[model samples]
Structures are given as C-alpha cells and as structure tokens.
Target: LVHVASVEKGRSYEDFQKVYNAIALKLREDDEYDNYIGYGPVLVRLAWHISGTWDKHDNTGGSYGGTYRFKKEFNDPSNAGLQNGFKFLEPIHKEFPWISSGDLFSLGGVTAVQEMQGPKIPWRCGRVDTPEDTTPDNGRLPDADKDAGYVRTFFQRLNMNDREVVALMGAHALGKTHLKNSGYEGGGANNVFTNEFYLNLLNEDWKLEKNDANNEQWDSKSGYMMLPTDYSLIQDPKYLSIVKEYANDQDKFFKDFSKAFEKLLENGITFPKDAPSPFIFKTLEEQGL
Candidate 1:
C-alpha cells in the first residue's frame, strides 16, 4: 500500500512544532527510566520499530498505517520494552488529540534525535489510522542472533542498500540493549547520539561470550555489547568499508544517517511532487524551550 501524504487541514510548522515541543519537554521531565537514561532512547527505538516493519516488495507493513496501536502488533515479542515509550507519549497524545499515531510516532524520533543534538531528520505528515486488519504479522523485525549475510538480506526486504543499512544501524549508538528486553546489554553513552557505535566496533577488542540468558553476544570491558549483526558490519567486506567511513568521519555519518532515517520512516509511502516538502523541525534548543 503506497500511502500518499496529505497535509491535515489548516496545519503548518507551528502545529507540529507544538507537538514536538510537548514531546521534547516530557523527554526532559521524565528522567527516571533506566537510571536516568530518560525517555529519549526508547522513544527513538519505538519510532524505528514502527517504521522497521516495512516490506518494500508489497508494501504490506510500515509506519504509514499506525497499526502498532493494535493488540497483535503491540504484543509482538520483538517489541518488548517499548511499552515504556508508549506510556510516556500517552499524555502528549491526549493534549494534541489531532495528530495521527503514525505522525506522532515518527516525529517522536525526529524530536529525540535533534533534542539530543544528533541530526536533523526531515519528516513528513499524512499517515492515517488503519483498521486492526491492516497490521502486519509478527516476525518482520530483525533478530539479534544473526550474521552479516542475514543482516544484508533482511534489510533488502525494505529496499535498503549496503550503505543505507550500515548508516541506519549507527542508531544503536543511542540506546543500550536491556538484558531482559533483548537478551543483550550495554551500548555507547546510552543517551548521546554519536558515531560511537562504529568507533567502538572498529576499536574494541570484543570477546564473544554467552550472557546468563545463553545468548551469544560480543562483550568488552568498556561495558558495551555488540549483537552478532552489529559485529557483522565489520565482518562483511562491503559493510566494512562503509563502517570505516562512518567511524572516521562523524559529520559524514550524521549526514548519511539523517537521510537513511528519513527514508526508513517514509518507505512504502508515496508523495506527489506537489505535496508539501519534508519538514525540517526546530529543536527545543532553537525554540528556547
């Protein structure tokens, strides 16, 4: 289903900015989760999980339908721990009752990235709510217990190329993998969004070990763990080149990540040329909030 974005009647930058501000403010106020990792990382994760279901082959699932609100999609075992983000956004949803679930979910990520001083991800609006029947089945999301070939093959379903895949995974830098959530643990900074994941991949002397849950993960004394899929970036020759590029150049990684993230959120959704251009939102810092 190729969704064409149609601007909501009488909405412009300010209205969305108001929503962005609400999300940003709560991100600051809700500072207790994960020992003060706050809501930013999980909000970003929620947006990615919602958008990640896209299958470019038939356009079956993606961020356009906002179907994650349904029970079956919400209950997918892959989405464990994301409930924290959903609960945090519930109050904002009540306040800005007009925004669609799809727009709010995607915009929450955009706001988090910019507020955390990461990058400006251009976003679009016009995703409408769909019936529960439209929800894509579970298992579309990627698994951590996979290799480089598996990573490359999985993202191809979303029509992503090698460079795009490598760039998108740089987001792992923002959040830690909870032991209970994904049977993985620790990531760089856990709050600040940087190319630290790539740097760590290239620099860390990671030892392969099994967690208490008996899941294989790459561990380092730096208190970071890399899923096999993450280590695969360096193992695969094609992905390795892009990883080196991003690890060496922070600005380049940010630029590529911004493009890939916007593309990820917009996949399977079409916009007529006459449709409004993507929105480059103002960060709370810029708005003096």
Candidate 2:
C-alpha cells in the first residue's frame, strides 16, 4: 500500500518537455473538440480526478498509482467524460512509451493550463503504474450537487483546506458541462483559463433552475451555469471571502491556484530528499514554436 516516487530510468526534464509539447500541439490541432473548447478542460479534469482519489487517512488511492487506465477506474460513473482526455493522450503515449501513466496524466493537466495561457504549474515525475486491482473504487470523487458544508467536508478527506478548495474551483472557468456526459448543467464556452470563475460567481445574478437533467443548478443571464457546489462558494461566508479575493486579484488567483493544484496532484506521494526540483515547462509560445 506504500507508493514511493521513482523517476523513470535515465529520463530527465527534456524528456518530459517533449511529451508536454506533443500534448500541447495536439490540443491546438483538435480545434473542434467539445464545441471548440478543445481538450484542455477535460485534460485538466482528468488530472484532478486521477489525483483526487487520494485518502489521507490510509493513503488508499492517488495519482501515485496511475490506476485510471484499468477498467474499473476508467468505467467509474464519476469519470464519465474523461475518455476524451485519455483518447487524446493515446497517440502521445504510443510515441513516448517510457512515461508512467500517473506522470502523463498529471503532466497533461500542467501542459493544458500553461498552453491555455493559465499559470505555469510546476510538475514532477515518477509515478509507477500499479496493478489493476489497485484501482480505487468509484464514488471517491466529490459530487457537484452539494452545498458549502458538503464541499468543505468532502475536501477535508483529501486534506484540501478552504482557500485551496476555492482556488481549485476557479478551473471551472475553463470548460462547459455537457449534460450528456455527466448530467451536470452546461452553458458557458469560455476556453481560456483565467480568474473568471470567481468574477462570475461574485457578479452574476443567478437563479436556481432544474436543467434538462433534472438537476438543480444556478443559471445566469449570461448563459453561464454553476453547479450547486460551485455556487456554494458564494453562499458560504468563509468561501465567499476567498472567491471575492480571487475575483479582485487575478495574479493572486493564479499564484494560489498553481500552488494548490500542484499539491493536489502530488498528494499520497512520497519523494526522496534527493528528488530534483519540480520541472516548470515553458509554453509553446515562449519557445516561439
């Protein structure tokens, strides 16, 4: 049940950067995905879900194992739409057969955010793929139809505090929810990563409505929709303050999100003191590619 971090044999930063570039290039070419939202959002979601399974008490499931490739984890009802992300990475994995599944999944999220003009997320490698039976059972991920209390308690299982919870939710600004995928509410098409999730929560005039999925979601006049859990940020006094702070300061939001997200992906992982510093890859634009 112990998963120690071990870097892929003889691989270094440049090796991972090539994988990042392959993911970034495909993200650019696959323009028609999810109605032009591309694969960035789903890739981000994929990384989160893959990492979110960690349980601090016993260290049962986490990104360290990369067990999502197994049938049980892949078929989890909560992972309904993530096949798109896995499919997007299929060819990349074929090309770089050396990378571990956990590293690739987490790196995809880092690449997507950076390539999408979001903050640079520092990433580390060395998650060995575990056996199929090591896959965590379904229902480990959080629900979207809860309140602030539930959101707060649920994240505690993953050791995420209030600010971290709020900052991570800012990723909601990336993609719209497809009802056919998860039966969650859908509307917004903002593909660019920003602090817009916080701004929308604070500024919008939201009305509760039952969507086609018969789910209660907060809808706004601007055609954006927020899951009940998303709306909870504004409803709870503590969460609302962080939401307002992130709404007012974009740089602060980016900084906070980078830290929280990196920690999220690194949970349930133990690295030696000798492990290299986390690698921060430059965007394709920075390389002038």
Candidate 3:
C-alpha cells in the first residue's frame, strides 16, 4: 500500500476550506436535479461508488486512479444517474485544474456530507489519472435485489466489518433509488442530506406497494420508499439492532457514519497516526466572509 502525503496542494487548512466553500456555493446554485431533490444525495452516492470500487487485497481498482473521468467508467451501469453529479463537478474541475480527479470526487463527497449536517471527513491527495482501459467492470457495486447477508458479504470484499457495513448503508437515507437509474423507485424524496432516514424507518408504517410502473418498492403513509436492501437492515437480526440504535440516537449515527465513510474513501491507503488531524472546513454559508 502506498502512503501519500496529504494533498491539500501545499495549501494550508484555510485553502481547502475555501475549496469547500466553492463546492457548497455551487451546490446551492444547482438545486434542480432528479425531481427538484438537489444534487446532494447523488453526489454522496457518486463518491461512494467511486471509492467502493476498491479491492483491498490488490491495490488495482481503488479511488487512486480517478479514472472515472473516462467514458467507460462514466458509463458504468452502477453509475447511471451519476452523470448529474459529474456534470455538477465539471466547473469545479475546471476552476481547480491542479486537483486530481480522485481528490475532487472524494472531496465532493466530504463537502456534501458536511454541508448536509454530517460529520467532518478527513481526506488526502496524490491519485494520478489512469487510462480508460484501467476502469473496473460494473459489478463492483452492491445490488439492491440482495438481502442483508448479501450486503454484509459484498462489503467484506472492500474490507468492511459488520459495524462498517451498517454505517455505510445508512447513507441510503440521503438518496432514493431511481427507476431509470436503479430499476427501483422512491427511497427518498427531496434527497436532502439528513439522519432522517432512520427516523423515517422507525416512524413510517410502510406497506409493500408497487409503483405505477408495477415495480415493487416499500412505501410509507408519509410517501417514502425503501428498497429490499434498505428493508433488510431491519429484517436481519444483527443489522436490525444497529438500525434500531441509529434510529434512536442521531449522535452515534453521525459518529459511526463519519468513521465508516472516511474508511470507505481510504481503502488500500495507509495514514500514519502522526498525520495531521482531519480538517473540518466550514460550509459556504458558515464562512460568512
């Protein structure tokens, strides 16, 4: 595994904080995506999908390549709806041409989560671009049709444990599974970033319902949807316990999710303990400069 120095571009903590503000401002401007839900959720999903491709055993497919810039990766079936997120980042990439694709994608995710009230994510740099052919196949992502056991085993390939797996899936709260995108419909409406996913799980009296297109997705009286994988969290005994725990306490949910998210982005890379503590950038509005 390679140990690259932090990629704040020789920039001080304040420099990256400004970059965070730029991303936050852009996010506010681009508010009309996927049924006026905004780009926050998909951006988070994009970051996850980009980093999730890593296989810890071999350092081949991690976020290090930043090869998603290529058509083959951009067109990945798992990334169907993510074109919106990519489009969202185009300008930022142009503005910060020096930043690597890996850094930009990972930073975008960090920015989205923090802006949405999630915890601060520590990040690093030094991923160089690889050719289009270097891109991995589409199957590297998780399948919605599978069960909780499947979700657990799938994450193991990425070197995540039970606790981490549960924490990562909690992100499903931010974005809904689109029909055209995932062949499943309605997991979230107004895809705002929030721990509200757990709250919805606990409070809603969900009924198994098929959409107008006749696809099966769980809908609640409050009009939200859950995919089979999302439902599995409550069905599997172990997964159910964590789901219940997060549903009851938001702080624990934030802490666990923050740790798990940082791990997900750092696969196949090692960070020394003495490295700088994770930088917490203020949101654009918070900067008030």
Candidate 4:
C-alpha cells in the first residue's frame, strides 16, 4: 500500500523542530517524575507500543492510525502505565494542536531519546488521524512471560529481525518495569539512555525469582531485573551473539538501534517518493541546552 504524503498544511522542518524542542524542554523540567527517572523511558515505550501494533501482512495497526487517543486503545491492559506518557504529551498537543496524534506520539519517543543522550532517530511527520473505529484490538504487543522463540515470532509480525529486535530491546536500559504496571520490576539508571542494558544482561549474576506480583523475573543485587523475554537473549545463540556485540560496542549499538528504531516507528506506513526526507533534530546538548 502506497501511503501518499499528507503533510500538515504549511508545516515543515522548523514546525516539527519546535514540537521537538517543546517535548525536550518538558522532559528536562519534569525531573521529579518516576522518582526522578523522568518521562524518557515511558515516552519511548509509548512510541514502540503505538508502532508495535503494525501487522506486516496487511498493515492494519501502526503509528499511522492514532487510535490510542480512543478509549479502547488507551485502556488496553498492555498500555497500563503509558497514560503517564500520554498525560505528559497532553500540553504539547494542546500547544501544537495541528500535529496528528500519531506524529505527536512517535515524536515524543524521538525527542526523549535524543534529549537523554541516545541516538538520533530520523523521523517523518505525515500520520493522518484516523477514526476510533480504526483502532486495532488488544494483544498485539509482545508478552513478557515468553521466551526466545516467542520474542522472535512476536516481532516477526512487524518484520523485525534478530539484530533489530536485540538492538531495540537495548532500550530496556532506560526504564524499570513497574510490578503494578507489568508484573515485573527493576532496571538501571531509568532515565539515562545507554547500552547498559546489554552490559547488565551479559555481566550481572541475575537470580530468578517471583516478584510481589507473583510473576517470575530475573533480579540482580544492583536492583535490576529482566523479563523472561530479556533472558531469552542469552538462551538463544543468534540473539546472544548480537547481544554480546552490542554490550561490548556501545557505538555500534547506537547506530544499529537508530536504524532499527526508525524502521520500527515507520512500520506499516509507506512513504511516497515525493515525501520529505526524514528529519534528524538537534539534541538539546547540541542546541546548547
């Protein structure tokens, strides 16, 4: 399916950059959230969750349809803790009401990553708002209780390969899983965007135990935990090799992750040849923040 560009009327790079700056500024200002972890992790998760629903077969659910604004999608059990990210973006949306929900949601992830010293994600802005009826049903997101094969197959619908999947999971470094939110707990430097997730996975001596929610998770003395899917990286030979590579070389991980993340966000949305090139916004550091 060819997705013809539907750029917002009279909007261009500067307009979107303004939105990016707004999100970035708010991220720094909202330092007290999540015990000072801020909103970066959840925003990235929000973008992934929004884009992860895409089905490669027919391109049904994707970032293209901003259905998450609807009650059904917002209330999905899998999206339990994401309301925080949504609420955080609320003011930004009000300020820039012309931006489509999909664009705003996905851009929030891009802004968060760059603001937190992660890779530059080239993003496009042309996701038209769809009606609530276009919202996809729940259960498309991956299950944390699953293993390597499950992780591989779950991402298959979105057409992600082993390398991309592993690189994307590197995002686990940024946020802890709230037991109340996902029945899992623990993560490292919840606000910093780095390759520490892969490092921890490779170096930490994690013990398997059930959390207060009665779900099994791998815990370490450093106050970090991993889901069954996370541990699957080591259990699977192919994934483990890539995991090791990423853990050892942070720069390679950042480069590969930038590509994979851009692909993930753009999944199920075709760009016409005439569409504008992807925009790589300046990081707050580069902008003299």
Candidate 5:
C-alpha cells in the first residue's frame, strides 16, 4: 500500500487561489478552439482523463501524481481528443511554473466544472511528480461501445458505486464523443453544456447507424448522438429510473453531478474535513471586483 500524504505543508490556500486565478485568466484568453467551441469543455475532459488513471486496488496511478505532462501519458489513445485541453494549459504552466502537475490538472477540473455553472468542487494541492514508470497503461477508461452492464462493471474497478457511475457519465452531457476522438461519434454537441443528456435519452427516437466514416454508433433525427453505452442508461431497468429522474429534474442533475464530480476529482487522494471549502470562483465576466 503506497500511502499518499496530505497536501504539502509549504503550499497555502492563498497560493492555490492564485493558481486558480492563473487558470481562470487563461481560460478567458483561449476563447477559440474546436471552431469557437471555447476551452471549458476540453478543460473538464483533461481533468477527467487525469483522475481516471487511478486503480483502486493498488492505488499506483491517480491524480496525486500529475504525470500526464509526460509524453507517455499525454500521448495515450484514449486521450486522443484531449490535446486541445493540454495545449490550452501550456501557457498556464509557463506562467505558474511552481504548481505541481497533479495539482494543476486537478485544479483545472475544479475550475472547469465551476466555471461551466456546474458546482463548486473543493480542491487541495499535494500531488507531487512521479517517475514515468508510474503512468497507468491505456484502456483504463470506459469504452463508448459497451452497455450499462459494462459501464457498471468498468466503474467498479475504480471503486465507484452506481450513483457515482451515473453521475460521471452525465459528463457525457458536457462534451461529445467524436468518432475521430473515440471511434464513436456525437454523444452530444461539442459546445452546449447542459443537463440535457438525460432528457435527450428519453425524448429522442434513436436509430443506430454508422457515420460518414463508417462506425457503428447511434444517431437521432434531432441531430444529436449517443454511444451504445450512453444509450444503455435507458435500456437497463435500474439505470433507467435515475436517467428518467435526471431528465425530469435539472436541479437533481446539478446536485448529484456536483457531488459526484467532486468525488471523481478527489479520487485516490485524502483530505481533512477542515480542508478549505472548494474554491468557487466567479466566471471571467463576473470577476470585475
């Protein structure tokens, strides 16, 4: 058991708040990506990719060691479409060279979720750099082609329960699963961040079809898309109930997503209850004060 320590004693709340400022500032600057799609979605994806590296059994890989900046982890196929998010963070890294990579990546997730009007994720810093050997192998993330049973079983390896798995997939609500990106296409639009993922599942009459590039995926007359795994939320009896709940209630979606996202970001790390409440920064437009 590789026992990880709490945040570094040398770093302070104010220091990370400034680190938050650095990320927030650059997010405002990099407004044109994916054809004016903005940096917010990719930022969330980056955080997800970093924390998703954890293996609950050994605790060998996780957000605690920010190793994604290394070529090996950064070049991962599962991370194919996330380079935009990494590139977005490059300038921030240059500006604030002192922040740890784990801290930066995790903080990026926090900033993205809050900035997107999702939730305030409390963040702590102490993740130190580790050797290249620590990077987890590829294929740790869930496949878009699988079903609810597969999704459920996959998350169990991460030690996530039913509620957590559902909430995390709600992230599919934020970013699309591009064919080029995931060998699957159109889980949702590239921009348009909302809790509508659940709504689309119930409301749409979906036809499973291949894209112009020829891949087996789901498409809808509404022009939205859902992967086989994404649509399975509706197919399974137990999963369907929660999918219906979120589709009907946006507040429920927001609240559950907030809690689950915080849990996801904090995967493989421990924090004292007295740790500073998650930093909820005002968006760029709201930062006049």
Candidate 6:
C-alpha cells in the first residue's frame, strides 16, 4: 500500500526540463488538433483523469501505478477523449523512454498549463509503474452530469476541500467539450488558461438545456456552457463563495490551483525524506525559445 517515488536512474531537473521542452515545442507545433485549439486542454484533462483515480482511504488507485497504459484504464468510459492526450505523449515517451508513465502523464499537464500561460505546477519525478492489476476499475472518475452535492462528495474521495475543489475546477476555463467525447457540445473553444470559468459562472445568464445527447447542460448566450457539476460552484453556498473569490482574483486562483493540482497529481504517492524538492519548470517563452 506504500508507493515511494523513485527518480529515474541518473535523471535530475535538467533531464525533465528536456522532456518539458519537447512537450512545449509540440504544443506549439501541433497547432491543428481539436480544430486548432491544440493539445493544451486535452493534456490537462488527461493528467487530471490519470491522477483522479486515487482513493485516499485505501490508496489502491492513483497516479503511482501508471496503469492507464493498460487496456482496462485506457478504455475507461470516463477516459474516452483522453486517447488524444496519450497519442500526443506517445512521441515524447518514445524519445524519453526513461520517464515513468505516471511522471510523464502528470508532467504533461504541467507543461500544458505553462505553455498556455497558466500557473507553474511544480512537479516531482518518480512514480514507478505497477502491474495492470493496479489499474483502478472504470467509473471511479466523477460524473459530469451531477449537481453541487455530487461534485462535493465526489472530490471528497480525492481529498480535495472546498477551496481546492473550486480552484481545480478553474481548469474548465481551458478547452471545449466535444459532444462525441462527453455527450455535450460547447460553443467557443479556448486554449488559454484563466479565471474565465468562474467569471462565466457568476456573470452569465445561464439556462438549463438538453443537448443533442439529451444530457442537461447550462448554456449561456455568450457561447459558453457548463456541466451540471461545473455549475454547482454557484449553487452550493460555500462553493459559491470560493467561486466568487477566484473569479475576482486571478493571482490567488493561479496560486491556489498550482498547489491543489500538484497535490492532486501527487496523491497516493509517498516521497522519501531524501526525495528532491519539486521542480518548477520554465515555460518555452521563459527560455526564449
């Protein structure tokens, strides 16, 4: 039940920086994916999905196992659209084969966020892959059609509190949901990371409507939409307060998201007292590349 982080042999901050560069470069070069929104959002979603399986009580499912490579986790219904993110990383993995699946997957989100002008998600090395049996069963990821109570309860399983949950949901600011992928269609797609998700939640005049797939979604006249789970931020009193805070303060949201996301990705993994400090990677722009 204990998963210790083991840095890839001889790898250090510089080595992972190379991997980050590769992902960032590809995020810039591959400009045609998802109707030119590129891979940023999907990569973030992929990382979240990979780590979201963690159950704190038993620690059976988490990023530590890296079992998403197995068919069971790869084909998870909640993971339908993630193949794109996996395919995107396939080349990076091939080039830097030493990186563990868990590390690579989580790091991709860090790279994507940075490249998209989001917060710097300090990342750690290690997370050795386990056997296929370690893959959590499907249906562990939260459902998109639920309400505020469901959203709150679901995140509790992942050890996220009200503020952390609200901060993490800010990720919805990036990317559009595809009907084919999530049974819901979106208006305009976005790749930039921002507090827009919260802004839209508080500012928009939203109506409950069923999409072509007969799933209820909150739609705004401004070409944005929210899943029931997303809209829950406003419906729940405590969640609404945090949502308002994030909507008004970009710096606070970024800082909180950086912490919560790193926590989410690190769930269920133990770091030795000697493990190196988490690496804060530079964005492609920061490197002047």
Error of 6 at 110 (Å): 0.4
* Cα lDDT of model 5 by residue, 1-289, tens digit: 4535356566677777777777777766777766566777888888888988788888866777787888888888889988888877777888878787888888887787666666566665767777888878876876777788998888887788877777777877776666677777554464444678888888999998987667677788878888888888888988888888887888877788877777776778766666655555555546662
Q: lDDT tens string, model 4, 1-289?
A: 4444489998999999999999999999998998899999999999999998899898788998888999988999999999999999999999999999999999999999988899899999999988888899998988999899999988889999999999999998887888788887655556778898898898999999988888999888987788999999999999999999998999999999999999998987878788899999997778887
Tens digit per residue, CA lDDT, model 2, 115-219: 989999999999999989889989999989889999999999989999999999999999888898878768776779999999898888999999888889999
Across 1-289, the per-residue lDDT of candidate 3 in tens digits comes to 4635445456667766767777888888787766676788888988998998887777657777787788877888988988988989999888878777887888899999887777777766555666678787777888877788899988888999877887788787786777787788665465555567777777889898777566677788777888877888888899888888888888888899988998888786665665566677776656674
C-alpha TM-scores of all predictions? 0.97, 0.99, 0.91, 0.98, 0.91, 0.99
Q: Name the candidate, 2 or 5, with the larger lDDT value.
A: 2
**Alpha-carbon runs more than 4 Å astray in model 4:** none
Candidate 5: residue 31 Cα off by (Å): 1.8
Q: Candidate 3 — worst ten consecutive residues by lDDT sum?
A: 1-10
Instruction: Give me the displacement of residue 240 in model 3, in angstroms.
Output: 0.7
What is candidate 1's lDDT per residue for 1-289, written digit by digit as tens?
5687777777888899899999999998888888888989898999999999998889989999999899998998999999888898899999988899999999999999988889899999888877899999999999989999999999999898999999999988887888888887655457888998899999999999998888899988887879999999999999999999999999999999999999999987888888777889888788777
- RMSD values for the candidates in order, in angstroms, are 1.1, 0.7, 2.2, 1.1, 2.2, 0.7
Instruction: Compute the lDDT of residue 273 as modeled in candidate 3.
Output: 67
In order, candidate lDDTs are: 0.90, 0.93, 0.78, 0.91, 0.76, 0.93
Q: What's the candidate order when arranged by decreasing lDDT?
A: 2, 6, 4, 1, 3, 5
Which segments of candidate 5 are over 4 A away from where they belong?
Answer: 6-9, 187-192, 272-282
Instruction: Tally clashes: model 5.
Output: 1
The CA lDDT at 159 in model 4 is: 95
